[PDB]
């Protein structure tokens, strides 16, 4: 069991689509890495200057859209690649 | 044609009836053996001389004159040393720390044969040498390319050590005393390094010379055959050099040609009869 | 005995595995330096603007996943290499 | 005597060891500057936004491990080289 620190979130990157808006199979650099994933673990919460900590908005089980960058890190847990990043990288939650 | 008298007669006849040339060639053949190599080069005096070297010797001297412990002869001599065979370039001392500490505990000299050693490592080694922590000498590995690797493996089989290479799957920092070769004496000077009575099982040496013989049987050019024969002689036989003596240069060239003819004729007579 | 100041943590990074997901020996640059270590010493805690100090969330004993960077420093204590870095470089705690 | 301002600390860099884990003498670039020093003088303390000042955690007399950088300055006092740097450059205190 892996749990993040403060306001970091662990997500599982979804498989990139092969057939796009029809039967056309996309092969090569065109298939951009999918920016949707399923959150697995959520940290305790970001810490304020005064001293109180507030819980994150994202709940375990939500599909999120995230901005890949230098702040997003890749880690291999349970022989499975997962993404560890700060909650500020989360842009929207699907449904 | 097996007896030495017949060989001397063949060499005498082939050298335009010169008894000294035939006698010298017979002596060289007797001393060096059957798997050895005899070469002829120019001398300096007026008389022919024969120099036969037994064991392993290559044309590499020490990488620093400060390694000398016997200034009387100007040479490095080590008694019962360790041999570190590295198929790599050594520049940072940090890779050398563990084995150096281990040999310091053991208390016997160490000879490092590497592709080349950088100035920082030379400075560290020369500092450590006379201060009494460890007795170290370093030389460059003979040959260039694949032949250098073959010579390193030959030295490893002779001394009973293992070559440290990246391509084989080992690193220098993980070396132990088992990986280091051993010998009885090592003599180093300006130009040549000589390993005397390296400890090794005859089975490995015989396997290596058999492998090189099978390599000889499948080579085309004469230069490669000569190099392989030199390697076989270094492993098992000996190496002889005949220095031709003459007053002038025309006489020198004439006598050198005659001695080479006698050498070729003796080889042919030994292999096929008379 | 080494004790860090404020919110710094001393860890001992784990040995890089040789056999990976089978018997295949991984030799060379493929074996990336392991980003898991066992914390040895934990600082008193980070200092807030008003002045009170809050304790760090990592306890001595657990395994952490950390992000190696310019902020992470290596030091030799007890003739053993250890890693000193700020607590903010800790991403997750295993188990 | 020399007294630092605010949260600056004056230390005396330890002599770089020659023999390493045995009798092997290291000469040249191998012997790096030791990151340990003896604290000589300690400033009054860092000043907070409100106006209160809190004294530094390092006391005069202990051995510290410091991160040499552009913030660390070298000064020749009493015909002796000393290092003046902010307290944030101190990583740990030995013993």
Query: What residue in C sits closest to A83 (Cα-Cα)?
Result: C91
Report the SS3 class of residue A31. Answer: coil
B172 and B246 part of one domain: no
B216 and B189 part of one domain: yes
Which residue matches tokens 């990074």?
C13
Nearest Cα to B138, choosing from B121, B160, B158, B162?
B121
B143 and B200 part of one domain: yes
Nearest Cα to B179, choosing from B164, B198, B201?
B164
Q: How many Cβ contacts (< 8 angstroms) between chains A and C?
A: 39
Give how far A79 is from chain C: nearest CA, Å: 8
B269 and B197 part of one domain: no
Helix or strand run (H / E) with residue B222: helix B222-235
Method: cryo-EM
Of A4, A47, A49, the CB nearest to C91: A4
Report the SS3 class of residue B96. Answer: helix
Q: What is the dihedral of CA A57, A60, A65, A68, to 10 degrees?
A: 100
Give how far A19 is from chain C: nearest CA, Å: 31
Give how far B76 is from chain D: nearest CA, Å: 21
The CA distance from B178 to B158, in Å, is 15
B94 contact residues in D (CB cutoff 8 A): 30
Residue ranges making up the domain that contains B10 = 1-54+236-273
Which residue matches tokens 């003599």?
B187
The CA distance from B10 to B242, in Å, is 17
Q: Which tokens belong to B222?
A: 């004469």
Tell me, yes or no, whether chains A and B touch by having 3 or more C-beta pairs under 8 A: no
Total structural domains within chain B: 2
Count the neighbouring beta carbons within 10 Å of the beta carbon of residue A64: 19
Q: Is D2 on the interface with B (CB under 8 A)?
A: no
B159 and B220 part of one domain: yes
Query: What residue in D sits closest to C49 (Cα-Cα)?
Result: D48
Query: What residue in C sits closest to D49 (Cα-Cα)?
Result: C49
D25 contact residues in B (CB cutoff 8 A): 124, 127-128, 131, 133
Yes or no, beta carbons of A6 and C57 under 8 Å apart: yes
Residue ranges making up the domain that contains A22 = 1-95
Which residues lie closer than 8 Å to D39 by C-beta, 6 or more apart?
D9, D10, D11, D58, D59, D60, D61, D62, D63, D64
Burial B131-156 (b: 16+ CB within 10 A, else e): eebbbbbbbbbbbeeeeeebbbbbbb
Which residues lie closer than 8 Å to B206 by C-beta, 6 or more apart?
none
Q: What is the CATH number of the domain that holds B151?
A: 3.50.7.10
Handedness of CA B78, B81, B85, B89 (dihedral sign): negative
Total structural domains within chain D: 1
Distance of alpha carbon B170 from the chain centroid = 26
Phi, psi of B144 (to 5 degrees): -130, 120
Q: What is the CATH number of the domain that holds D56?
A: 2.30.33.40
Give how far B105 is from chain D: nearest CA, Å: 9
Nearest Cα to B242, choosing from B256, B229, B226?
B256
Q: Is D21 on the interface with B (CB under 8 A)?
A: yes
Yes or no, beta carbons of A2 and C52 under 8 Å apart: no
Report which DSSP code applies to B93: G
Which residue matches tokens 């884990």?
D21
**Angle C57-D65-C38 from CA coordinates, rounded to 5°:** 40
Task: Please report the resolution in angstroms.
Answer: 2.5
Helix or strand run (H / E) with residue D85: strand D80-86
Count the neighbouring beta carbons within 10 Å of the beta carbon of residue B16: 12
Q: Which tokens belong to B141?
A: 């590995």
Could you tell me what percentage of chain B is helix, strand and coil, using 3-state DSSP and rounding each to the nearest 5? 45, 20, 35
With beta carbons less than 8 A apart as the criterion, state whether D93 and C44 touch.
no
The CA distance from B271 to B263, in Å, is 13
Pairing mode, if any, of strands C8-13 and C63-66? Answer: unpaired
Yes or no, beta carbons of D54 and C50 under 8 Å apart: no
Question: Helices B222-235 and B202-216: crossing angle, nearest 10°?
Answer: 170
Distances (CA, A) of C15 to B70, B82, C29, C31, C68: 47, 31, 15, 11, 15
The CA distance from A35 to A56, in Å, is 20
The CA distance from C22 to A90, in Å, is 36
Pairing mode, if any, of strands D8-13 and D73-77? Answer: unpaired
Count the neighbouring beta carbons within 10 Å of the beta carbon of residue A58: 17
With beta carbons less than 8 A apart as the criterion, state whether B186 and B77 touch.
yes
Strands annotated E in chain B? 37-42, 49-54, 56-58, 76-79, 82-85, 89-90, 110-114, 116-117, 136-140, 181-182, 185-188, 193-196, 238-244
Residues forming beta bridges with residue A10, ordered by sequence position: A41, A84
């Amino acid at each position: 069991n892996i749990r993040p620190l403060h306001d970091r979130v662990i997500v599982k990157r979804k498989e990139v689509e092969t057939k796009s808006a029809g039967g056309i199979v996309l092969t090569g650099s065109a298939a951009a890495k999918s920016t949707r994933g399923e959150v697995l673990a959520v940290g305790n919460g970001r810490i304020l200057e005064n001293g109180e900590v507030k819980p994150l908005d994202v709940k375990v089980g939500d599909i999120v859209i995230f901005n890949d960058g230098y702040g997003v890190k890749s880690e291999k847990i349970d022989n499975e690649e997962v993404l560890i990043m700060s909650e500020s990288d989360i842009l929207a939650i699907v449904e | 044609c097996s007896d030495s008298k017949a060989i001397a007669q063949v060499g005498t006849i082939s050298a335009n009836s010169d008894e000294t040339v035939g006698k010298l060639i017979a002596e060289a053949m007797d001393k060096v053996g059957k798997e050895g190599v005899i070469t002829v080069e120019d001398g300096t005096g007026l008389q022919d001389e024969l120099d036969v070297v037994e064991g392993m010797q290559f044309d590499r001297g020490y990488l620093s004159p400060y390694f000398i412990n016997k200034p009387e002869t100007g040479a490095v001599e080590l008694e019962s040393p360790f041999i570190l065979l590295a198929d790599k370039k050594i520049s940072n001392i940090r890779e050398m720390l563990p084995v150096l500490e281990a040999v310091a505990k053991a208390g016997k000299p160490l000879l490092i044969i590497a592709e080349d050693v950088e100035g920082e490592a030379l400075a560290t080694l020369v500092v450590n040498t006379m201060r009494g922590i460890v007795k170290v000498a370093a030389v460059k590995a003979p040959g260039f390319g694949d032949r250098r690797k073959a010579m390193l493996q030959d030295i490893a089989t002779l001394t009973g050590g293992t070559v440290i290479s990246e391509e084989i799957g080992m690193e220098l920092e993980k070396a132990t005393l088992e990986d280091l070769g051993q010998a009885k004496r090592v003599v180093i000077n300006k130009d040549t390094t000589t390993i005397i009575d390296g400890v090794g099982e005859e089975a490995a040496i015989q396997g290596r010379v058999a492998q090189i013989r099978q390599q000889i049987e499948e080579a085309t050019s004469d230069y490669d055959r000569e190099k392989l024969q030199e390697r076989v002689a270094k492993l098992a036989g000996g190496v002889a050099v005949i220095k031709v003596g003459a007053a002038t240069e025309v006489e020198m060239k004439e006598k050198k040609a005659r001695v080479e003819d006698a050498l070729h004729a003796t080889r042919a007579a030994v292999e096929e009869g008379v």
